[PDB]
Write an enzyme that holds these catalytic residues in place. Structure first.
Site, PDB file in Angstrom:
ATOM      1  N   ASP A   8      50.238   5.811  89.556  1.00 11.66           N
ATOM      2  CA  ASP A   8      50.989   6.891  88.931  1.00 11.66           C
ATOM      3  C   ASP A   8      51.634   7.743  90.013  1.00 11.66           C
ATOM      4  OD1 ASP A   8      51.750   7.937  86.336  1.00 11.66           O
ATOM      5  OD2 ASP A   8      50.930   9.819  87.050  1.00 11.66           O
ATOM      6  N   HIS A 179      49.027  15.361  84.676  1.00 13.47           N
ATOM      7  CA  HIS A 179      50.169  15.525  85.584  1.00 13.47           C
ATOM      8  C   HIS A 179      49.752  15.754  87.029  1.00 13.47           C
ATOM      9  CE1 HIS A 179      52.448  15.435  81.963  1.00 13.47           C
ATOM     10  NE2 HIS A 179      51.798  16.492  81.500  1.00 13.47           N
TER      11      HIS A 179
HETATM   12  N1  LIG Z   1      58.317  17.834  80.690  1.00  9.99           N
HETATM   13  C1  LIG Z   1      58.823  17.562  82.013  1.00  9.99           C
HETATM   14  N2  LIG Z   1      59.718  18.347  82.604  1.00  9.99           N
HETATM   15  C2  LIG Z   1      60.125  17.995  83.835  1.00  9.99           C
HETATM   16  N3  LIG Z   1      59.738  16.939  84.595  1.00  9.99           N
HETATM   17  C3  LIG Z   1      58.864  16.214  83.946  1.00  9.99           C
HETATM   18  C4  LIG Z   1      58.350  16.456  82.655  1.00  9.99           C
HETATM   19  N4  LIG Z   1      57.385  15.394  82.298  1.00  9.99           N
HETATM   20  C5  LIG Z   1      57.414  14.612  83.418  1.00  9.99           C
HETATM   21  N5  LIG Z   1      58.234  15.112  84.340  1.00  9.99           N
HETATM   22  C6  LIG Z   1      58.510  14.540  85.613  1.00  9.99           C
HETATM   23  C7  LIG Z   1      57.851  15.230  86.839  1.00  9.99           C
HETATM   24  C8  LIG Z   1      56.528  14.503  86.893  1.00  9.99           C
HETATM   25  O1  LIG Z   1      55.960  14.601  88.206  1.00  9.99           O
HETATM   26  C9  LIG Z   1      56.947  13.092  86.658  1.00  9.99           C
HETATM   27  C10 LIG Z   1      55.851  12.155  86.210  1.00  9.99           C
HETATM   28  O2  LIG Z   1      55.384  12.527  84.932  1.00  9.99           O
HETATM   29  P1  LIG Z   1      53.786  12.402  84.648  1.00  9.99           P
HETATM   30  O3  LIG Z   1      53.571  12.666  83.185  1.00  9.99           O
HETATM   31  O4  LIG Z   1      53.059  13.505  85.338  1.00  9.99           O
HETATM   32  O5  LIG Z   1      53.189  11.157  84.982  1.00  9.99           O
HETATM   33  O6  LIG Z   1      57.993  13.158  85.653  1.00  9.99           O
HETATM   34 MG   LIG Z   2      51.230  11.759  86.260  1.00  7.28          MG
HETATM   35 MG   LIG Z   3      52.951   9.298  85.011  1.00  9.68          MG
END
Ligand SMILES: Nc1ncnc2c1ncn2[C@H]1C[C@H](O)[C@@H](COP(=O)(O)O)O1
Ligand SMILES: [Mg+2]
Ligand SMILES: [Mg+2]
Ligand SMILES: Nc1ncnc2c1ncn2[C@H]1C[C@H](O)[C@@H](COP(=O)(O)O)O1
Ligand SMILES: [Mg+2]
Ligand SMILES: [Mg+2]
Ligand code: NA
Ligand code: NA
Ligand code: NA
Ligand code: NA
Lengths: 219, 219
Positions: A8, A179
């Protein structure tokens, strides 16, 4: 496939923003460790396999994080830089290669929404380097495709596919450390331990070469 | 010192048995991340710093584990081998070097009972390789020496120094994942976050070069 490498990433924003990686976690599990897992309703949260290799790295991006990305991940460019983190560079590539060389081959990366986010973004970062890609001999799968295939096979008769939604639907508890690259890899592992032989069969039959993944954007 | 690298190892037995490493975990924290920590009595368990690099690897030993070692760690040679783990070899050394090269220098390893166990054992393993040691430019400290110095300074007027005893005395909860390399590194980090500026001052003033550490036994 001998080894599954749960992957991830966190990054500066969503794909439209041409994002750069800020955190990366790999968790390598031999297939035996997953086959050996195992409960109830709701089942208790499975214990992770004992024998695992893990790498989690924070990475200074070349551009600022968007507000949403910074606020959900708890990372910012300025904080990463003040703590001395280095960019995504050739030494990181050497590190990834040595880590992969410790795993029994072939290896398959497993990422949640990998086809639309993690895999193309990682390919973008690797394409910026002078070192040949350390991932070119690996395979990959999107875990969401595997879960949806399991749903269709278990209920042909007929919802969030967020990582947290799936985990909570399975175990009736909220996940922790959402996250963060490592927290989300651990949540994904726990989901996959629910019916591990079907992740494995999906991987064994539908994995594709990481070299087929196109970069998210041009450099 | 710019970076503290919390270190813990599992292995096949106690020093008399000429043990070999079965698991290694490094957790690198910039000094800023520790200075920025912070509660009550008992205080709640501190949250780890957000910006950290972690490496945790299982390693196939060349000899069998003693019963006590296998039973408390949950590792065995046969299980490590059936899951394809590789020996402590030159590629592992390259991996360690690349991981260390990502950290701001100078770096100090921090291990609980490091002077009598982790450091000399790691030096033994590194001495078996053809690659120059990746640790020769690093420093090290034994966290137990730091805690005891803190006790003497805080109560000159006047007990288990087990990792679990110290954690439970501080936080009135039992630690988790005892005798796993990563679990014990995380427990040690939580202990050090209790009064982080005094770990830091101990490290800044009493760290020594890892190149002074003698191997646990000859090879
Ligand atoms: N809601 C939102 N706004 C802005 N950027 C976002 C959002 N959801 C995910 N991301 C972007 C920034 C995270 O580090 C990445 C991985 O999502 P992850 O779910 O942590 O694996 O994607
Ligand atoms: Mg993540
Ligand atoms: Mg992710
Ligand atoms: N009681 C006992 N019997 C045998 N071998 C032992 C025992 N305690 C520690 N060890 C050995 C094997 C562990 O992997 C290693 C590190 O101890 P750690 O505490 O996990 O950091 O030391
Ligand atoms: Mg220890
Ligand atoms: Mg330990
Ligand atoms: Na964005
Ligand atoms: Na483009
Ligand atoms: Na022993
Ligand atoms: Na000897």
């Amino acid at each position: 496939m001998q080894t599954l490498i749960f992957l991830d990433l966190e990054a500066t924003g969503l794909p439209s923003s041409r994002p750069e990686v800020t955190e990366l976690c790999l968790l390598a599990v031999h297939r035996r460790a997953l086959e050996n897992t195992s409960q109830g309703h709701p089942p208790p949260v499975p214990r992770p396999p004992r024998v695992v290799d893990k790498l989690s790295l924070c990475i200074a991006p070349g551009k600022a994080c968007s507000p949403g990305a910074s606020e959900i991940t708890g990372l910012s460019k300025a904080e990463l830089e003040v703590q001395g983190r280095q960019r995504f560079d050739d030494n990181l590539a050497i590190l990834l290669r040595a880590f992969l060389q410790r795993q029994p081959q072939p290896c398959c990366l497993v990422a949640h929404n990998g086809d639309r986010y993690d895999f193309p973004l990682l390919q973008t970062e690797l394409a910026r380097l002078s070192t040949p890609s350390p991932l070119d001999g690996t395979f990959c799968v999107d875990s969401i495709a595997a879960l949806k295939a399991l749903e269709q096979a278990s209920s042909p008769s007929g919802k969030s596919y967020s990582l947290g939604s799936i985990y909570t639907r399975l175990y009736w508890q909220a996940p922790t450390d959402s996250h963060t690259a490592e927290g989300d890899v651990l949540t994904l592992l726990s989901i996959c331990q629910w019916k591990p032989q079907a992740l494995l069969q999906w991987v064994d039959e539908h994995a594709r070469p990481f070299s087929t993944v196109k970069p998210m954007y041009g450099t």
